[PDB]
Design a protein around this ligand. Structure first.
Ligand SMILES: [Cl-]
Ligand SMILES: [Cs+]
Lengths: 394, 257
């Protein structure tokens, strides 16, 4: 029994061991009352504004659309403290944890960006933070590990399973089922068991709220489409949420195509996966024909989540949002193009979204269209990856 | 067939609790797992609880996570587990067999199709680790239509409304995990006419089996102590079986109060 609907159509739910249900019910109740509490809203807005840097700019691209009839705006979440949109929701979840009287934070990370976000929120708000990371991801992201340790977070490697993100998602839940009286589980995307898809959406929704006010101010109309990459779904649903009722606005989510769909080495469960039950939810996932859960592949570490938030699968099924894929090579070209023409280094995650926008513009260069891309982070963290690929090629 | 009812009827006439080992199917290999199971029954197991290897067992601790990896290393698939289950049931017609599943394997080829296959191979009960009572309707309805007992865990943090649901929805037995005093949990469960409760938290020694029975539980499940004997003795398979035999027969003697 819950206060809110745990399902979006047929997707979602609370598929956890019984022992965790009270933790989830307590969290949903605290969230519902926090959302009706003006003082919680004011503290959250204060931290976003004076600590994280909101509202972020909405930049009109000057050079990239030259010789077409496309107008492209970038919502500059790369300018947020931390360099990625993840900061918005970890601040809200950390305030929630304090509201519940919790004093410790548990989080999972793969690429390391959610771990860094969790650790910086925990240091600011005086919470003890422990982070689970797959030992393969530990070795490959030792910059972000040092960052987490500098911020006072305890990092714990996971060798269980494939020792990647999904195996981190499991050991965080095991810890929480024992510690939830004093600890809050800061899940990193808009997926998992209810109420997390709902909470994370609501703590990211200022992205689309700002974008709407900013585009009406600059162009006097709503965009033709807003485009966002989809790893687990938080930055996309944060951009989409405020436009869902504006039915003239296309909502386009971009899943990583990896080496290409037909190769099977991709991370596109929404369009090329299969509904199953894992990580507390019913949702499309990467799985074998026997029902075992596979990994996604993408050149961007941050799109490595093998499933997708349930609200996105709902939005797809009813035809309100459209989902497409973009391969490693397409995202790399979009990465280079934004650097050379606009002087902005985008995250390789966000380059997937940009790459689809450039495809829309180039395929139909005389189509008049107003596009907004959610630039969900900056790409300083990717320059070594991009460098190695470009030397290996010439 | 109602193997649980028969089992509990016979145990009660001889003032005994049930001893139930858990073991992952195919650990450490298909043929050696079949040896392990025949050894456990021969040494006095009253019923079996059997896990199907799953990629992401978020409700399990490290001993079981490694059991799954060992079975995946051996090439064990769900279809092979169901082959193994038919052999086990052909050899042992009366022992209750319960599966510990994760929801995706149950969901994969259709919920109804999964329980239909259990009834075909002679499984008696299914516990789905990541399906709380609140989400269980399609699973237990499919279980009941195919004469399979749906098993639910009653955790230590159980409130009264959970007790009422577990007692109404479960069949076969109630899986007991260990703030609330234990003997009044067994009391409330008997109040609500729940299926007999088996204690399954940290049952490692004969003294814990005796404690569970005296506390009011119909028996005990040793959810990982058996997998640890397999882990320790992986290099010597004949010492593995002798250690399993001595442990199980010790634990089962403890159930005779
Ligand atoms: Cl600003
Ligand atoms: Cs994904």
């Amino acid at each position: 029994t819950t206060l809110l609907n745990p399902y979006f159509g047929e997707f979602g739910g609370m598929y956890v061991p019984q022992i965790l249900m009270p933790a989830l019910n307590q969290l949903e109740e605290a969230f519902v009352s926090a959302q009706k509490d003006p003082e919680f809203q004011a503290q959250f807005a204060d931290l976003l504004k004076n600590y994280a840097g909101r509202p972020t700019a909405l930049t009109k691209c000057q050079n990239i659309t030259a010789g077409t009839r496309t107008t492209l705006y970038l919502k500059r979440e790369d300018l947020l403290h931390g360099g990625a949109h993840k900061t918005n929701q970890v601040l809200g979840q950390a305030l929630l944890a304090k509201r519940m009287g919790k004093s410790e934070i548990i989080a999972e990370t793969g690429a390391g960006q959610h771990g860094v976000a969790s650790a910086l929120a925990s240091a600011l708000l005086g919470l003890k933070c422990r982070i689970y990371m797959g030992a393969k991801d530990v070795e490959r992201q030792s910059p972000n590990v040092f960052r987490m340790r500098l911020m006072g977070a305890e990092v714990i490697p996971v060798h269980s399973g494939s020792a990647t993100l999904k195996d981190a998602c499991n050991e965080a839940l095991r810890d929480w089922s024992g510690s939830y009286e004093t600890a809050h589980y800061m899940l990193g995307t808009a997926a998992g068991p209810h109420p997390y898809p709902t909470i994370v959406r609501e703590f990211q929704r200022m992205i689309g709220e700002e974008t709407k006010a900013q585009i009406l101010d600059k162009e006097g109309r709503l965009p033709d489409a807003v485009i966002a990459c989809v790893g687990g779904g938080s930055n996309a649903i944060g951009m989409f949420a405020d436009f869902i009722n504006d039915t003239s606005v296309g909502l386009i989510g971009v899943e990583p195509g990896g080496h290409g769909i037909e190769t099977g080495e991709h991370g596109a469960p929404l369009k090329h996966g299969r509904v199953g039950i894992y990580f507390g939810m019913k949702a499309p996932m990467m799985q074998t024909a026997d029902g075992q859960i596979e990994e996604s592949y993408s050149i961007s570490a941050g799109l490595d989540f093998p499933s997708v938030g349930p609200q996105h699968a709902y939005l797809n099924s009813i035809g309100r949002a459209d989902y497409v894929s973009i391969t490693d090579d397409e995202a790399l070209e979009a990465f280079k193009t934004l650097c050379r023409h606009e002087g902005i280094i985008p995250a390789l995650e966000s380059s997937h979204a940009l790459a689809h926008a450039l495809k829309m513009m180039r395929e139909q260069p005389e189509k008049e269209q107003l596009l907004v891309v959610n630039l969900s982070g900056r790409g300083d963290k990717d320059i070594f990856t991009v460098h190695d690929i470009l030397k290996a090629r010439g | 067939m109602e193997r649980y009812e028969n089992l509990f009827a016979q145990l009660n006439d001889r003032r005994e609790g049930a001893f139930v080992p858990f073991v992952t199917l195919g650990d450490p290999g298909i043929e050696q797992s079949l040896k392990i199971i025949d050894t456990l029954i021969d040494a006095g197991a009253d019923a079996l609880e059997l896990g199907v290897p799953f990629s992401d067992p978020l409700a399990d601790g490290p001993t079981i996570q490694n059991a799954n990896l060992r079975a995946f290393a051996a090439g064990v698939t769900p279809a092979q587990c169901f082959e193994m289950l038919a052999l086990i049931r052909e050899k042992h017609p009366t022992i209750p067999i319960g599966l510990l599943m994760y929801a995706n394997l149950v969901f994969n080829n259709g919920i109804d199709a999964f329980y239909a296959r259990c009834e075909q191979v002679g499984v008696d009960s299914v516990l789905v680790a990541d399906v709380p009572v609140e989400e269980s309707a399609p699973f237990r309805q499919a279980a009941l239509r195919h004469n399979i007992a749906p098993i639910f865990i009653c955790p230590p943090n159980a409130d009264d409304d959970l007790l009422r649901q577990v007692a109404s929805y479960g069949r076969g037995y109630t899986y007991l995990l260990s703030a609330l005093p234990l003997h009044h949990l067994i009391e409330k469960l008997k109040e609500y006419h729940a299926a007999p409760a088996l204690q399954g938290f940290g049952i490692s020694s004969p003294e814990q089996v005796s404690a569970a029975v005296r506390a009011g539980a119909a028996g005990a499940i040793s959810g990982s102590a058996i997998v640890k004997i397999i882990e320790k003795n992986l290099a010597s398979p004949k010492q593995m079986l002798a250690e399993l035999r001595s442990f199980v027969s010790a634990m089962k003697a403890a159930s005779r109060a």
